[PDB]
Design a protein around this ligand. Sequence first.
Ligand SMILES: *[C@@H]1O[C@H](CO[C@@H]2O[C@@H](C)[C@@H](O)[C@@H](O)[C@@H]2O)[C@@H](O[C@@H]2O[C@H](CO)[C@@H](O[C@@H]3O[C@H](CO)[C@@H](O[C@H]4O[C@H](CO)[C@@H](O)[C@H](O)[C@@H]4O)[C@H](O[C@H]4O[C@H](CO)[C@@H](O)[C@H](O)[C@@H]4O)[C@@H]3O)[C@H](O)[C@H]2NC(C)=O)[C@H](O)[C@H]1NC(C)=O
Ligand SMILES: *[C@@H]1O[C@H](CO[C@@H]2O[C@@H](C)[C@@H](O)[C@@H](O)[C@@H]2O)[C@@H](O[C@@H]2O[C@H](CO)[C@@H](O[C@@H]3O[C@H](CO)[C@@H](O[C@H]4O[C@H](CO)[C@@H](O)[C@H](O)[C@@H]4O)[C@H](O[C@H]4O[C@H](CO)[C@@H](O)[C@H](O)[C@@H]4O)[C@@H]3O)[C@H](O)[C@H]2NC(C)=O)[C@H](O)[C@H]1NC(C)=O
Ligand SMILES: CCCCCCCC(=O)OC[C@H](COP(=O)(O)O[C@@H]1[C@H](O)[C@H](O)[C@@H](OP(=O)(O)O)[C@H](OP(=O)(O)O)[C@H]1O)OC(=O)CCCCCCC
Ligand SMILES: CCCCCCCC(=O)OC[C@H](COP(=O)(O)O[C@@H]1[C@H](O)[C@H](O)[C@@H](OP(=O)(O)O)[C@H](OP(=O)(O)O)[C@H]1O)OC(=O)CCCCCCC
Ligand SMILES: CCCCCCCCCCCC(=O)OC[C@H](COP(=O)(O)OCC[N+](C)(C)C)OC(=O)CCCCCCCCCCC
Ligand SMILES: CCCCCCCCCCCC(=O)OC[C@H](COP(=O)(O)OCC[N+](C)(C)C)OC(=O)CCCCCCCCCCC
Ligand SMILES: CC(C)CCC[C@@H](C)[C@H]1CC[C@H]2[C@@H]3CC=C4C[C@@H](O)CC[C@]4(C)[C@H]3CC[C@]12C
Ligand SMILES: CC(C)CCC[C@@H](C)[C@H]1CC[C@H]2[C@@H]3CC=C4C[C@@H](O)CC[C@]4(C)[C@H]3CC[C@]12C
Ligand SMILES: CC(C)CCC[C@@H](C)[C@H]1CC[C@H]2[C@@H]3CC=C4C[C@@H](O)CC[C@]4(C)[C@H]3CC[C@]12C
Ligand SMILES: CC(C)CCC[C@@H](C)[C@H]1CC[C@H]2[C@@H]3CC=C4C[C@@H](O)CC[C@]4(C)[C@H]3CC[C@]12C
Lengths: 40, 40, 517, 517
Amino acid sequence: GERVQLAHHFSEPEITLIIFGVMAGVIGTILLISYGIRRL
Amino acid sequence: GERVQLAHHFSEPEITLIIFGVMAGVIGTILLISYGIRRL
Amino acid sequence: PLQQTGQLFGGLVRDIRRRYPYYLSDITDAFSPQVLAAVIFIYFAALSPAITFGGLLGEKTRNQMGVSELLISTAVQGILFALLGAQPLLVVGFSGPLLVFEEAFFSFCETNGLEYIVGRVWIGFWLILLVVLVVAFEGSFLVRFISRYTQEIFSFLISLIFIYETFSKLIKIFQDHPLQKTYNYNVLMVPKPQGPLPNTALLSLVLMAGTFFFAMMLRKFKNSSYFPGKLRRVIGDFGVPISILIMVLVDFFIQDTYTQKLSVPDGFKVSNSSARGWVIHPLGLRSEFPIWMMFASALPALLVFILIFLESQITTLIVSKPERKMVKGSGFHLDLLLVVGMGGVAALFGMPWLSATTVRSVTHANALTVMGKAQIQEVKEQRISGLLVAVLVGLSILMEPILSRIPLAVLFGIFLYMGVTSLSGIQLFDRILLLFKPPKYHPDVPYVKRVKTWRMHLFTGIQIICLAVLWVVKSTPASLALPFVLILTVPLRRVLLPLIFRNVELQCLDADDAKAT
Amino acid sequence: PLQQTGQLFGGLVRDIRRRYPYYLSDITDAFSPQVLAAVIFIYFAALSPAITFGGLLGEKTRNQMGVSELLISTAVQGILFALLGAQPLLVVGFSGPLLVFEEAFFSFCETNGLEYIVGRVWIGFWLILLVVLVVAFEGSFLVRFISRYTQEIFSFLISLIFIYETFSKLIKIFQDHPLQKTYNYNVLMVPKPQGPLPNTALLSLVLMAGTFFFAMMLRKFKNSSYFPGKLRRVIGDFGVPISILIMVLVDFFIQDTYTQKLSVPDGFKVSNSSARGWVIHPLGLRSEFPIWMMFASALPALLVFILIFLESQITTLIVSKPERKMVKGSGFHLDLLLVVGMGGVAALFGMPWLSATTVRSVTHANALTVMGKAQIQEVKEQRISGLLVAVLVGLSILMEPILSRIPLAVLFGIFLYMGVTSLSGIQLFDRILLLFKPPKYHPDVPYVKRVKTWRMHLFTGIQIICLAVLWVVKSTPASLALPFVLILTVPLRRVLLPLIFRNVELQCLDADDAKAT
Ligand SMILES: *[C@@H]1O[C@H](CO[C@@H]2O[C@@H](C)[C@@H](O)[C@@H](O)[C@@H]2O)[C@@H](O[C@@H]2O[C@H](CO)[C@@H](O[C@@H]3O[C@H](CO)[C@@H](O[C@H]4O[C@H](CO)[C@@H](O)[C@H](O)[C@@H]4O)[C@H](O[C@H]4O[C@H](CO)[C@@H](O)[C@H](O)[C@@H]4O)[C@@H]3O)[C@H](O)[C@H]2NC(C)=O)[C@H](O)[C@H]1NC(C)=O
Ligand SMILES: *[C@@H]1O[C@H](CO[C@@H]2O[C@@H](C)[C@@H](O)[C@@H](O)[C@@H]2O)[C@@H](O[C@@H]2O[C@H](CO)[C@@H](O[C@@H]3O[C@H](CO)[C@@H](O[C@H]4O[C@H](CO)[C@@H](O)[C@H](O)[C@@H]4O)[C@H](O[C@H]4O[C@H](CO)[C@@H](O)[C@H](O)[C@@H]4O)[C@@H]3O)[C@H](O)[C@H]2NC(C)=O)[C@H](O)[C@H]1NC(C)=O
Ligand SMILES: CCCCCCCC(=O)OC[C@H](COP(=O)(O)O[C@@H]1[C@H](O)[C@H](O)[C@@H](OP(=O)(O)O)[C@H](OP(=O)(O)O)[C@H]1O)OC(=O)CCCCCCC
Ligand SMILES: CCCCCCCC(=O)OC[C@H](COP(=O)(O)O[C@@H]1[C@H](O)[C@H](O)[C@@H](OP(=O)(O)O)[C@H](OP(=O)(O)O)[C@H]1O)OC(=O)CCCCCCC
Ligand SMILES: CCCCCCCCCCCC(=O)OC[C@H](COP(=O)(O)OCC[N+](C)(C)C)OC(=O)CCCCCCCCCCC
Ligand SMILES: CCCCCCCCCCCC(=O)OC[C@H](COP(=O)(O)OCC[N+](C)(C)C)OC(=O)CCCCCCCCCCC
Ligand SMILES: CC(C)CCC[C@@H](C)[C@H]1CC[C@H]2[C@@H]3CC=C4C[C@@H](O)CC[C@]4(C)[C@H]3CC[C@]12C
Ligand SMILES: CC(C)CCC[C@@H](C)[C@H]1CC[C@H]2[C@@H]3CC=C4C[C@@H](O)CC[C@]4(C)[C@H]3CC[C@]12C
Ligand SMILES: CC(C)CCC[C@@H](C)[C@H]1CC[C@H]2[C@@H]3CC=C4C[C@@H](O)CC[C@]4(C)[C@H]3CC[C@]12C
Ligand SMILES: CC(C)CCC[C@@H](C)[C@H]1CC[C@H]2[C@@H]3CC=C4C[C@@H](O)CC[C@]4(C)[C@H]3CC[C@]12C
């Protein structure tokens, strides 16, 4: 980034990839729940 | 009028009635001539 | 009315028998709101030219004739014309050509050493003799040969000149107070600012634009379909006074910025108490008047008579067209007699002779015009409006506190409105607009569907050349030859235009009553 | 395009199949001078709000988000929307409610010590999840419950707000540079005038009015009968660019006076080079971002989602009305997904999330509308105009020598043109006019000919009360609740209105395609 920044374990791409993976996981969970409902 | 004006023989009313009378006589002259013409 | 009876003073007598039976209606038809709105509109439209021409007259004549003399002459002549004239809708006042003659005469009198005020007295004496003879032999009947050709050319030229001078005054304001990074914050104010002032020119343009905008918006609102009709009609009739009130109020609330205001004289005194009195002696004031100039005054009298005759009679032709719905008639002999005789009499009092002014009279007639449900329904033909305008002009000296709060820029927008709206009935202006319009759009009028489009455009362009010629002559030292150059259009219409136009196109294009031959 | 299919992403897929076959026409249909004129118009119409909102954002965010970020975000999102959106006539940019949210979040982040940029990164992250769920479950089908009632109420309110803000900017110039007898002639001009300057406010008024007047005159010139028609149409298409060029030249030739000019950032750099880089770490910049705010970002993300959803979908409803003659289709699922996902992604780069603004999109669609011989014939539906507008917005940093000569007052008159021309198709505005018009005048439309006049005016006055309520809400600190109060007008039409209006009256007044039941 700019100036003096605190150093994290994950970089920007690593953290954004893990957050997008979590988002994909919860989206898939909700979609599978919706598929389970309206059928049984 | 104003200031120092030239003193004439006739005052303003006297001269203006003189000019008006001369004009009236002249106008009567062309009117009488026009009455004479177009008839002979 | 233009018929030649053959009897002495027959035209003058016929004019009295035609209009004077309507005298009772000429008072009672004014009891309408539109007549009151017109009086406020024509009051300013007649006062501001009076002040401007009087100040310019005073600057060129050394105050021998000035604002007070012009105001008193305008008031007295307007009152007497409204009480006795056969066409009371005419507005009698000073004009540009009259100012050009007054300078030309003053310069000759100074070159030859004559007294200018005394020399005029003799011109006025000769003016009365000329007009009496002309009226006696029905000389006003030659007006019938001034067709719609010359009338439209003259009216369009006068309106264009009025618009041009109205704009040139704003450009003069911008030159006197230019836009600069820095100004002098300590500038002498009396009598007029001695240097440029901030915001003056820009505020003058805004007060002009706004006056013209609201005037036109209220004019459109009168013909619009909004509000109860009687309320809309009363608001639209007061359009110009409402716009004047709004903008003057806007200038009144901005008090830091300077704007030029109307300046009437302090009292009813001659502009120069040291040069002349109220009455001018025909034999001289400080020097005896030569006897040769008493007879030599006839030629300037002839020129003045020609100017006043052409202006007043063409104005009467324009305002009394059949398409304007005038049912009360007009007097071409009585009005000329009154105007020229009052001018000759006012010459004895050291006052300007006047003439019926085209733009002012057309504005007066338009403000009294009632429109039907696009078409003209009737005109409020009465005497009270012009009489009250003349009375207010005479009293304008006493109402200095009211007139000192009215900027010229508001009046400039009003003048631009008058110049724009004076073009409505001129067929030359419609044909000029048809030049830029594709032929299919052309309206359903006789000169479109009975004349080929290129022939009509040629006829318009021939008139445009006359307009340019008259405009060039005006902007030359020989601008007093303008009446003769204008009268040269009559032989053009009657002799040369038959040569290249067949008779049917002449009937369709140059028609007195706008008929399809 | 608003039906619910019962299949996951069913709206999104049908949205692609509806519009993407027309992709070849979406490039070739832009080969017309009207498209270029619309490009020039919408370039300024999108660039000036971008600069103003970016300056306000930098002033309120301490430069954490500023002009450069807003410009680059607008450019990238507009390019991607033009290349991929199902309705390429929408203009995507910052709006007032978004500015109100950026300020409110900054205060909460400042109060609890949370870095503002990182919270936006998490709000945008929550924005992506919310829009995916809405699109996957066809949540855009709820737009069908927004009838002409809410659409016209929102459009009229937004146009009134736009007009009010444009006039307010001129008022501020008068307040900054008051008209006054004296001025300091030696006033520092860097970086903004540090004191009142002469002729500035008046010149700003004359420029704004000049450009508005020229734009309106050229718009009338389009519909007039003057000039060769194809040449007239060309000139009418470029009317706003011609007015802008004329007034820019007018201010160019006045060198001494000072008028505020367009200012773009110096380069493609972050507004504050100390605060943040181009990429924001979700875990924190200087201090570690707390875990609770990662989950608590959903609620402000929710509010942002309602704001953008309401604005964009109502704009899509207004622009894609059947009466506007759009035959290429509009996609309510694809554009929402694109806008909200692009905003959520741009949050990660420290960039504003945008929305489909109403005034700019309506102006863009109107500029591409081809009028018939009063009746809309067709609209130039293409992707090139919006793409070029976004490209020019992104390139505006390198066009500083061109933009630095353009006054804000010219753009102010352009904004007033846009505001007054955005009211043409609104039946609420027409019915507001019918309040001041006598019943005989009323037009031959179904809500006049089949509904009693007092019933129609009661229907209008109920809408007027809603307008007053919404305008009041916008004036309080709780102005972010405007979408919810606007939504409350849907139960009013569907529940409360049938309690006082018959079904025939509701069909006539609240008509989807302007049909007489
Ligand atoms: C009110 O009226 C005053 C008087 O006007 C005079 O009398 C009336 C009855 C008319 O006959 C007028 O035509 C006449 O001027 C005004 O006072 C006068 O103001 C003007 C302007 O300041 C001056 O008048 C004269 O201007 C002549 C040029 O036009 C000049 O001739 C000179 O020509 C050139 C300069 O242009 C010189 O190189 C020559 O050498 C020559 O001198 C006049 O010169 C002489 O005229 C008479 C002769 O006796 C003397 O009285 C003068 O003092 C001077 O010696 C003269 O400059 C005068 O200032 C003044 N003249 C008089 C006679 O009072 C007054 O201005 C006006 N008020 C307003 C507000 O306009
Ligand atoms: C570019 O960014 C500069 C710094 O931004 C910093 O980094 C980013 C990532 C964010 O985390 C920012 O919040 C952060 O500051 C900007 O420079 C800053 O300008 C402002 C305006 O003068 C000042 O910042 C702070 O303002 C606080 C007020 O809200 C103030 O608290 C004070 O409140 C009252 C009223 O001001 C005072 O009377 C109290 O005494 C109280 O202190 C802050 O005070 C202290 O905070 C820091 C925290 O570390 C201390 O280190 C300071 O020494 C200070 O005593 C502070 O004033 C600062 O001038 C400045 N902040 C920093 C950290 O440099 C810059 O404005 C921006 N660019 C533009 C164009 O705006
Ligand atoms: C304050 C004014 C009224 C507002 C308060 C409301 C109180 C109020 O005054 O309204 C009743 C009245 C209704 O009009 P209504 O049809 O009854 O009256 C007709 C109207 O005056 C037309 O203008 C006339 O035609 P035109 O124009 O001469 O051709 C027509 O004359 P005609 O057919 O017999 O020949 C009149 O009959 O007003 C309006 O015009 C509605 C618009 C209100 C205007 C809103 C202005 C604020
Ligand atoms: C700028 C002109 C060049 C100067 C030299 C003059 C040469 C010049 O360009 O004009 C002649 C030419 C005549 O050709 P013509 O009359 O056939 O052309 C008509 C004209 O283009 C109309 O505008 C069209 O109307 P619309 O909008 O389609 O309904 C009409 O189309 P439509 O009826 O078939 O559908 C056209 O037929 O154009 C004019 O009409 C005069 C324009 C008046 C302006 C002239 C001066 C401003
Ligand atoms: C409805 C209303 C109609 C609109 C017409 C507007 C015309 C404006 C008149 C200015 C012409 C002029 O003269 O500008 C030139 C002026 C003055 O001339 P100068 O040579 O500098 O003066 C020196 C002469 N001395 C010797 C007496 C000192 O200079 C300026 O300060 C430039 C300012 C002009 C700004 C124009 C205003 C906005 C116009 C555009 C509106 C759309
Ligand atoms: C179609 C294009 C627009 C046309 C509409 C015209 C609006 C012009 C702005 C007026 C309102 C305004 O701005 O007035 C407000 C200003 C500001 O006063 P303040 O006390 O310094 O403010 C106090 C705030 N402080 C403390 C920050 C300083 O008042 C003035 O300085 C008075 C001069 C106003 C001149 C009006 C121009 C003439 C307009 C007439 C045209 C018909
Ligand atoms: C057409 C009008 C002006 C009348 C015609 C003018 C001629 C015919 C007349 C009218 C008034 C006359 C003047 C009246 C008074 C006098 C004073 C006297 O001591 C000498 C003759 C003289 C100077 C006259 C000369 C001739 C005169 C100028
Ligand atoms: C002079 C400028 C300002 C305006 C242009 C308008 C004039 C020149 C144009 C407009 C329409 C034109 C006419 C259109 C059609 C025809 C019919 C053709 O068989 C002969 C030429 C003629 C009669 C044209 C003559 C020139 C014309 C009258
Ligand atoms: C809708 C979007 C915002 C996802 C929802 C956010 C929640 C469910 C997830 C997304 C990413 C997650 C973070 C990913 C990685 C870590 C690092 C670990 O050492 C502590 C927990 C922490 C910090 C997680 C906390 C929970 C978290 C914030
Ligand atoms: C608020 C202002 C601007 C609007 C004023 C106009 C309103 C109040 C007026 C104008 C025309 C009027 C209507 C004209 C005629 C009729 C027919 C009558 O059988 C019932 C009343 C009714 C239906 C009137 C109701 C009131 C009305 C709608």
